[PDB]
C-alpha cells in the first residue's frame, strides 16, 4: 500500500517542506537518507541504505525550489524529482494554465507515470497546493485534469489553501479561487480546506504564539497529514484507509469539502499541567476554536464527521465520548443520516519536533467532517468576486494570456448552482 | 468424523478467530507452536473435527482467513498462535474494499471468490464427513459483509445439505463505528435470511455493557470482547468435541430452536461472568448459572427480551453436573417467567451437557435463545436505512457500480415483511 | 529509650543556635541565622536525625558556595514573551535572596527545606475496591 | 461584530433551553398503565387463590 | 441593547446549561426503574398463578 | 434453617455493624481472612444462620452495608474482619445525605433503594427459609434514618410474613449531635409503628453512665460502645445459634412481649459488666447476674423505669445455669418489687436459657423489658417537635424538597396518641 504525494506552488512545498521533516523523524530517518516496512508506503528503499521519497516537489519559480536543494535535505529528494520553470505564472491563472502549464504539465505527468511504476500497490494521490496564487491554481488545475484522465478510477486527496475573507495578501485572488474551484469541483474527490487565519488563531490562542510565522503554520498542518495517514503507515485497533474518506464523507459527487481539525493543539507548559483525557479532546475538536477554518459551524448542521485517534486509547471511553457528542444540543446534525461519525484508532502517539511549538502529548485527535458552513465560505468569496467582476477590473490580464469572459461567467454561474445545491442538500 | 470448517471474513472476523483458535488449541492441549503437549487422551480423540494432520505432532487448524488488507493478515502472524496457520489458506486479496458492500460484491469478488472456493473446496473435499461450517464475520464493513455474504451464496448452492454457523456482529446507533452501517446491513440480512441456516446476532454495545456491569474492567480493549465471543463459540461447538450426558450438535440445536425457515436469528449469552474482585466470595451452583443465564443484562445482542417472548432456547452446559438441577432449574424458570414463553408451544427449552469445562474455570453454561425481541433490532436499522434512502444519501458509490435501485427496495421489503412476521408469532 | 528510638544519631533539635554559634566559634550574626534556620527545620520535631542534618547542609553548603543573578532578563520584551508564554522563572527565591522581598515571598519563604519524616502513623481516608469497581452504585445500576 | 456575537449566543441559548422527549413521556404512560393493569390482575389472582 | 435584553431573558428560561442533560437523564432513569418494577410485577403475578 | 439477612444503614448503623460482624466470627470461629479456625464443631451447624459458604471454607456474612459517603465504607474496608463482606453487597451512592431526612427518603432514594431492594432480594432468595431481618441504624441522621426508614417500609410491603428488628440509637438533650433531631426522630418513630415488628431502643447517653461507673473506662472511644451493642445483639440471637434447654426464638419472645400491636418499643440491658479492677472481687451466680440485671443504671436508655411501670420483660441467659434458680429468681425480684409490675397480667417475665456462654465469660444475660416509661423519653422528643414547629424554624428545607407540612401534624398526633395510650396503660 503506497500512496504519493505532489506539491504544487509556494505554499505547496513549503507544506513539503515541513511534512517530510515530519515523516522522516517519525521513521527515524537522517536527513542525509540512511536510517542509522512501515516506511515502505512513502520512501522506497534503492540499492543499499537508501530510502528515496514518493514525491514531486514542482513550481515555475527556480528561487524556493533551489533553496530546497542547497537546504538541509540535499540527499533525502531525488534530484530528478524536484522539478522548477524557468519563470513564475505571477498570480495568474489564465498565464499558469495556458501558457506555462503547456511546457511544465507534460514533463510532471511523465515523471509522476514513471514514479506509478516504480509504485505496486498505489492507493491514490494526495496533492498539496493554495487556489489563491497563480502556479498552484493554474497548473494544479491542469495536472488535475490530466491526471483524472489518466487514472480517473484512483482516489486524490487535495489539501487546498483558500484565502482567508479579512485577512489576505492578494488582490486578483478572487478570480484565481472561483476559476480553480471550478475544475477542483470534478476533478477532486475529497478536498480538504485550510486557511491561514484559522491557523492564526489557533497558534495565537492554544499554542500562545503572538508572533507565528509560516514555519509553525505548515508544522502542525504536517501534523494533520501524518495523522490521518497514520492508519496506512502502523497498525492500530481499528484501521481506516485512503479509500473510506471516499465513502463515508462525501454523499453526493458533487458536495466534496471538508473542514479540518485537530486538537489537542497545547504547548510545553500546557500540557505538564492539563490532566488529558479522551473526553476533553473530543470536545474540544469539535469547538470552533480549534477548526482550520474560520468559518461557524453553528450556523450550519453537519453531513458526515470522521475521527482519527493516535496514541494511548481504547474504543470504550472513544464510543461514550462520541455518545456525549451525539446527545448534546448545541450542536445539531442533518436528518439525511441518523449516523454520522467514523472513529480510526492508531497505537503510534504523535511524534514532536525539535524546535516545534507542541508537546509529547500521549493521544490526540484529527477529526474531518462535512457541514453546509463551507456552502457558506463560497458565497462569501463569491460576493467579493462579483464586486471585482462587476467593473471589469483586471480583466485585461486574463484576455491578454488568451482567455475570455465565457469562462468567467461560467465560472461564476457553477459557483451559484453549487450554492444552490448546498441551501438544497442542508433542507 | 464430523467436521467443521472455519472461515473468516473481515478485519473483525480475524481477531475473532485469533482468538478463537487460541481458546481451542489451549483448550486440546496444543501449544502455540503448532505441537501437542497435553496431558489427558480425551483431548485427542476429538482433534479431527478442528485439525489436520501435518508432520510429527503438528496439527493444523482447519481454517482460511480472507480479507483485502494485508494489516489483518499481519496482525495476525504477529501474535501467539499465529504460526499455526497454513500460509497457503492465507488467501488474501490487495486491493481493499472500504466500507463499500458493492465493492466487496461485485468488483473484488469476481476475482477473489474463485481463489476461497477452490480453498474451501480443497479443504471440504479432504475431509470425510462436513457436518457445517462456520463462518465469523461483521455486518458493518465492506470487505467482510460483502465477501463473505456471496461466499455464503457460493456454498450454499454448492453444498445444501451441510450446516452453516454464522457470527456476525450487528451494528448498534449507540456504537455507531460507519456511516454506511445500514446499507451494508440492510443488504447482507437480505442475503443470510435466504442463504444461512441460522445466525447468531452480536454487538459491541451488549459487550461493553457487559464489560461494564459484571466484569467491572476499567478498559475493556478488544482483546477480552473477542476473548468472550471466543468463548461463546468454543461453548456452542463443545458438544462435538467433547462426550457427556447427552449430547446435542450442530444439526440437533437448530431443529430444536427453528420452528420455521426464516425464524433462525438467535441471542447469545454466557455464564459464569464474575469480577476478579468477587471471584472468590461466590459459589459455583447450577441456581447460580441460571440467574446468571437468563438475566436480561446477559444477553449479547442489544434487544431488551423482557420485550418481547421467547420462541425457544437452549442451554449448553459443561463440567461435571446433576442432569436432576438441570431439568429442575429450568422448569423453575420456564414456571416463573410464565409470559415470556410463547402459549402455543410447550417446553420451550433444550438443554445438553457435556462433561469436560472449559480451562480456568469449575462449570459453564452457554445459552442460546430465539426470541422475538430481535424485531426491534431490525426497525431500529431499518429505520435508518427509509431515513437515508428517502433522500439518496451515499447512494451513487453504489449506483455507479453495477447495483441497482431494486437491490435496496427488495432488502427494505425482506427486513419489512421479516420484522411483521416476527411480530405476528409474538 | 522512651521515644524508642537509637538515640546515638539524634540531638535535639532545640540545639541548633548552640550548635550553630559553636560551628562558627565567633557569634551568629542575623544573615547567618536567617540561612541556618531556613535551610534546617526546627519547627516540627524535638527529635532530629543525622541524614536529615546532612541533607540539609549540603543545600546550605551550596547556597553559600554559589550565587545566581536573579536578574534572568536584561530585556523587558524578552521577559514579557515569556510571561505570556507562563514560561516560568527557573532559578528559586529562596536560594537567590537572603530575605523575603514582600510578604508573599514571606508566605511561601520555608517550604524548600527538607520535612523531617513524620514520627507518627497518618489517618488518611482512601478510596478502597469496593468504593472505586466493585460496590454497586446507581450509575452502575444505570448502565 | 459586536451585534453578530450577541446573536449566536442567543441563537444558542435559544438551542439548548428545552427537555420535552415527548415519545418518552409517552412510553412512560404505557408503562404505568401497564403496572396498573398487572397490579389489580395480581390482587384479583390472589383472591382467586383464596 | 435589545439583543441583550432577549439574551438575558431567554437565559433566565433557559435554567442553565446542565438543566437539559439532566432532565433528560432523569427521564431515562425513571423509564428504567419503571421497566424494571414492571418486570418484577410480571414474576410476583406468574408466581402467583403457578 | 432459620435465616437472618442483616441491614446496616448510615454512619452508625456501619460503625455498629462492622464491631457487630467482628463479635459474631468471633463466637464462629472465623479468622479475619474468612476461614475456619475453632475448635469446637457446635459453631459449625449453626452458620448458616449467618453465613454462606463460598468456596472451601470461605464463609462470607449475610449483610448489606447502605449508606451514602464513600468515608464510612473504607473505614468499614480498612478495619480488621472488613475484608470478609461481598463486595456486591456495598449498595452506596455517592453525594450525600446531610441530615435531611426528606433527602432520605424522597431525593436519594428514589434511585439507592431499587438497587438495595435488589440486593436484599437476592441475598432472601439465596436462603430458604427466612426467620426475619436486623436492621440497625440511627434516628437522628438522614442517610440513616431516613433510608432505612423507606427500606423497612419496601421490605415490609414485599414480605410481610417475617419478623424485623431494629436497633436505633435515640437522640437526648444532653447528648444533642443533630439539631434537627427531632425533625427527623418525630418522622422515623411516625413510620415504624407502622411498619416495624418490633424496636429496641439505644441511646449514647446510658452507654457513656454505663462506662463510666461500671465499666470505669477512662476515654471510651466509639469502638467501645458499639462493642457493648453488638454483645446486646449477639445476646438477642443466641438461641438461634446454638441449643439449650429453653430455647426462644425471635418471634417467640415478640409475642411474649408485645401485648399490643403499638407497644413494641423495648428498654435493653445486659450483665455482667464488671470493671477490670473489680472483676476479682466478685461472684458468678445467678442471684449476682440478676440484681445488676434489674439496675436502673444498667439500662441502655434514657428512661428511669421506677418512674413507670413494667409491661413485661424477658432474659436470655448463656452458660451452664440451674433452672430452678433462674425462675425463683425471676419469681422472687417480681414479687418483692410488687407495685413496679402491670397488675392485670401475671407472670411478667420470660425467661430462657442457653448452653453456650460468649467467650471470655462463664456466664452471661441480656434484658429485654417492654417498660412504660418510655414514654417519657417520647414526651422529650415531641415537646422539642412542637417548640421548633411553633414557629416553622428548619421547616424549608424540607418543604421546598416535596414534604408538606401535613405530615409534620401527622407525624406529631401520632406520637401524642401514643404517648397517650403508654400512660392509658400505666
Ligand atoms: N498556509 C500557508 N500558506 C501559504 C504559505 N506560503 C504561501 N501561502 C499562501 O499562498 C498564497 C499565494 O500563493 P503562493 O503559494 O504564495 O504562490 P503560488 O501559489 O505559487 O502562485 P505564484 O506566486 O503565482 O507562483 C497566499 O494566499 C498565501 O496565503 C505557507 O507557507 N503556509
Ligand atoms: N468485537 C470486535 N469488533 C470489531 C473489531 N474490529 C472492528 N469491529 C467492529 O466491526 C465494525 C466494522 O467492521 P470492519 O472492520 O470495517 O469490517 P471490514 O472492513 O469489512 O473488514 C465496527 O462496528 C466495529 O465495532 C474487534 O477487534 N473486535
Ligand atoms: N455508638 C455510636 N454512635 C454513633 C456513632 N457514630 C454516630 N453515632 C450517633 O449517631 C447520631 C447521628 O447519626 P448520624 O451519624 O448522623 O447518622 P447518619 O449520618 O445518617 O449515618 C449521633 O447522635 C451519634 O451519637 C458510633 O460510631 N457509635
Ligand atoms: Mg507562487
Known amino acids: ?427 | 468424523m464430523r467436521e467443521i470448517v472455519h472461515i473468516q471474513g473481515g478485519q473483525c472476523g480475524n481477531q475473532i478467530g485469533a482468538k478463537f483458535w487460541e481458546v481451542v488449541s489451549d483448550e486440546h492441549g496444543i501449544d502455540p507452536t503448532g505441537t501437542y503437549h497435553g496431558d489427558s487422551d480425551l483431548q485427542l480423540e476429538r482433534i479431527n473435527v478442528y485439525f489436520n494432520e501435518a508432520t510429527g505432532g503438528r496439527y493444523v487448524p482447519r481454517a482460511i482467513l480472507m480479507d483485502l488488507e494485508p494489516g489483518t493478515m499481519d496482525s495476525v502472524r504477529s501474535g501467539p498462535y499465529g504460526q499455526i496457520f497454513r500460509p497457503d489458506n492465507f488467501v488474501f486479496g490487495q486491493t481493499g474494499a472500504g466500507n463499500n458492500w458493492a465493492k466487496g460484491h461485485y468488483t473484488e469478488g469476481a476475482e477473489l471468490i474463485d481463489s476461497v472456493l477452490d480453498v474451501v473446496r480443497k479443504e471440504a473435499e479432504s475431509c470425510d464427513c462436513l457436518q457445517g461450517f462456520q463462518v465469523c464475520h461483521s455486518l458493518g464493513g465492506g470487505t467482510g459483509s460483502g465477501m463473505g455474504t456471496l461466499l455464503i451464496s457460493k456454498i450454499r448452492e454448492e453444498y445444501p445439505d451441510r450446516m452453516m454457523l454464522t457470527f456476525s456482529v450487528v451494528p448498534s446507533p449507540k456504537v455507531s463505528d460507519t456511516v454506511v452501517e445500514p446499507y451494508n446491513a440492510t443488504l447482507s440480512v437480505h442475503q443470510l435470511v435466504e442463504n444461512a441456516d441460522e445466525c447468531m446476532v452480536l454487538d459491541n454495545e451488549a459487550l461493553y455493557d457487559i464489560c461494564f456491569r459484571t466484569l467491572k474492567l476499567t478498559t475493556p480493549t478488544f482483546g477480552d470482547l473477542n476473548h468472550l465471543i471466543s468463548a461463546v463459540m468454543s461453548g456452542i461447538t463443545c458438544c462435538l468435541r467433547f462426550p457427556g450426558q447427552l449430547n446435542a450438535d450442530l444439526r440437533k440445536l437448530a431443529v430444536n430452536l427453528i420452528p420455521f425457515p426464516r425464524l433462525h436469528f438467535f441471542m447469545v449469552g454466557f455464564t459464569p461472568l464474575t469480577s476478579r474482585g468477587s471471584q472468590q466470595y461466590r459459589a459455583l451452583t447450577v441456581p447460580e448459572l441460571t440467574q446468571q443465564m437468563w438475566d436480561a443484562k446477559n444477553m449479547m445482542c442489544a434487544a431488551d427480551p423482557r420485550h418481547g417472548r421467547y420462541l425457544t432456547a437452549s442451554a449448553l452446559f459443561r463440567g461435571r453436573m446433576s442432569t436432576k438441577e438441570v431439568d429442575e432449574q429450568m422448569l423453575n424458570v420456564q414456571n416463573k417467567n410464565s409470559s415470556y414463553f410463547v402459549e402455543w408451544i410447550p417446553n420451550n427449552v433444550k438443554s445438553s451437557v457435556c462433561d469436560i469445562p472449559p480451562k480456568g474455570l469449575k462449570m459453564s453454561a452457554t445459552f442460546i435463545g430465539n426470541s422475538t425481541a430481535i424485531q426491534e433490532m431490525f426497525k431500529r436499522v431499518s429505520e435508518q436505512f427509509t431515513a437515508m434512502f428517502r433522500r439518496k444519501a451515499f447512494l451513487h458509490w453504489y449506483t455507479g457500480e453495477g447495483m441497482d435501485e431494486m437491490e435496496f427496495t427488495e432488502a427494505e421489503s425482506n427486513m419489512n415483511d421479516l420484522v411483521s412476521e416476527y411480530q405476528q408469532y409474538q | ?143 | ?50 | 441593547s435589545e439583543m441583550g435584553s432577549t439574551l438575558t431573558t431567554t437565559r433566565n428560561n433557559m435554567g442553565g446549561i446542565f438543566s437539559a442533560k439532566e432532565q433528560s437523564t432523569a427521564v431515562q432513569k425513571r423509564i428504567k426503574l419503571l421497566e424494571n418494577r414492571l418486570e418484577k410485577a410480571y414474576v410476583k403475578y406468574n408466581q402467583s398463578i403457578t
Not at chain 1, 286 to 300: I, L, N, Q, W, Y
Not at chain 1, 396 to 404: L, N
Not at chain 3, 65 to 84: I, K
Not at chain 4, 12 to 37: C, F, H, N, V, W
Open chain 1, 1 to 427: 500500500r503506497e500512496v504519493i504525494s505532489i506539491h504544487i506552488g509556494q505554499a505547496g512545498i513549503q507544506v513539503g517542506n515541513a511534512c517530510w521533516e515530519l515523516y522522516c523523524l517519525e521513521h527515524g530517518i537522517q536527513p542525509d537518507g540512511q536510517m542509522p516496512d512501515a516506511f515502505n508506503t512513502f520512501f522506497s528503499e534503492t540499492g543499499a541504505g537508501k530510502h528515496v521519497p514518493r514525491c514531486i516537489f514542482l513550481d515555475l519559480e527556480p528561487t524556493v525550489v533551489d533553496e530546497v536543494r542547497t537546504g538541509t535535505y540535499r540527499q533525502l529528494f531525488h534530484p530528478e524529482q524536484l522539478i522548477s520553470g524557468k519563470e513564475d505564472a505571477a498570480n495568474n491563472f489564465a498565464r499558469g494554465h495556458y501558457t506555462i502549464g503547456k511546457e511544465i504539465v507534460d514533463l510532471a505527468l511523465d515523471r509522476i507515470r514513471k514514479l506509478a511504476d516504480n509504485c505496486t500497490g498505489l492507493q491514490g494521490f494526495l496533492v498539496f497546493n493554495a487556489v489563491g496564487g497563480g502556479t498552484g491554481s493554474g497548473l494544479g488545475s491542469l495536472l488535475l485534469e490530466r491526471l483524472s484522465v489518466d487514472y480517473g478510477k484512483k482516489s486524490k486527496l487535495g489539501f487546498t489553501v483558500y484565502p482567508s475573507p479579512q485577512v489576505s495578501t492578494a488582490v486578483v485572488e478572487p478570480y484565481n479561487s472561483v476559476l480553480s474551484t471550478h475544475s477542483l469541483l470534478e476533478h477532486t474527490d475529497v478536498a480538504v480546506m485550510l486557511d491561514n487565519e484559522a491557523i492564526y488563531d489557533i497558534c495565537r490562542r492554544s499554542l500562545d504564539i503572538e508572533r507565528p510565522t509560516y514555519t509553525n503554520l505548515n508544522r502542525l498542518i504536517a501534523q494533520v497529514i501524518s495523522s490521518l495517514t497514520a492508519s496506512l503507515r502502523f497498525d492500530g485497533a481499528l484501521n481506516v484507509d485512503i479509500t473510506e474518506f471516499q465513502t463515508n464523507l462525501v454523499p453526493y459527487p458533487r458536495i466534496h469539502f471538508m473542514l479540518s481539525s485537530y486538537a489537542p493543539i497545547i504547548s510545553a507548559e500546557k500540557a505538564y499541567h492539563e490532566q488529558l483525557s479522551v473526553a476533553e479532546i473530543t470536545n474540544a475538536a469539535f469547538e470552533p476554536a480549534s477548526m482550520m477554518v474560520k468559518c461557524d459551524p453553528r450556523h450550519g448542521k453537519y453531513m458526515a464527521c470522521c475521527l482519527m485517534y493516535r496514541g494511548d486509547v481504547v474504543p470504550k471511553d472513544v464510543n461514550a465520548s462520541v455518545a456525549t457528542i451525539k446527545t448534546k444540543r448545541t450542536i445539531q446534525f442533518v436528518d439525511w443520516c441518523p449516523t454520522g461519525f467514523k472513529c480510526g484508532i492508531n497505537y503510534q502517539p504523535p511524534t514532536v519536533v525539535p524546535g516545534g511549538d507542541l508537546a509529547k502529548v500521549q493521544r490526540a485527535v484529527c477529526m474531518i467532517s462535512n457541514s453546509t458552513a463551507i456552502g457558506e465560505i463560497f458565497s462569501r468569496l463569491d460576493h467579493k468576486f462579483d464586486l471585482m467582476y462587476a467593473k471589469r477590473a483586471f480583466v485585461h490580464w486574463y484576455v491578454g494570456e488568451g482567455m475570455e469572459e465565457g469562462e468567467f461567467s461560467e465560472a461564476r454561474e457553477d459557483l451559484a448552482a453549487l450554492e444552490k445545491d448546498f441551501e438544497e442538500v442542508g433542507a
Open chain 4, 1 to 50: 461584530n459586536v451585534l453578530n456575537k450577541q446573536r449566536d449566543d442567543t441563537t444558542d441559548a435559544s438551542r439548548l433551553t428545552p427537555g420535552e422527549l415527548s415519545e418518552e413521556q409517552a412510553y412512560i404512560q404505557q408503562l404505568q398503565d401497564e403496572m396498573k393493569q398487572i397490579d389489580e390482575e395480581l390482587v384479583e389472582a390472589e383472591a382467586k387463590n383464596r
Open chain 3, 1 to 143: 529509650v522512651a521515644l524508642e528510638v537509637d538515640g546515638a544519631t539524634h540531638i535535639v533539635r532545640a540545639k541548633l543556635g548552640d550548635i550553630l554559634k559553636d560551628i562558627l566559634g565567633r557569634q551568629p550574626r542575623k544573615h547567618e541565622l536567617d540561612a541556618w534556620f531556613t535551610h534546617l527545620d526546627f519547627d516540627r520535631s524535638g527529635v532530629m536525625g543525622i541524614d536529615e542534618y546532612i541533607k540539609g547542609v549540603e543545600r546550605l553548603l551550596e547556597f553559600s558556595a554559589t550565587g545566581v543573578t536573579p536578574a534572568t532578563y536584561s530585556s523587558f520584551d524578552t521577559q514579557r514573551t515569556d510571561w505570556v508564554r507562563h514560561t516560568r522563572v527557573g532559578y528559586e527565591a529562596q536560594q537567590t535572596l537572603r530575605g523575603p522581598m514582600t510578604t508573599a515571598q514571606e508566605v511561601g519563604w520555608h517550604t524548600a527545606k527538607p520535612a523531617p519524616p513524620e514520627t507518627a502513623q497518618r489517618r488518611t481516608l482512601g478510596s478502597t475496591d469496593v468504593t472505586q469497581r466493585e460496590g454497586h452504585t446507581a450509575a452502575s445500576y444505570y448502565g
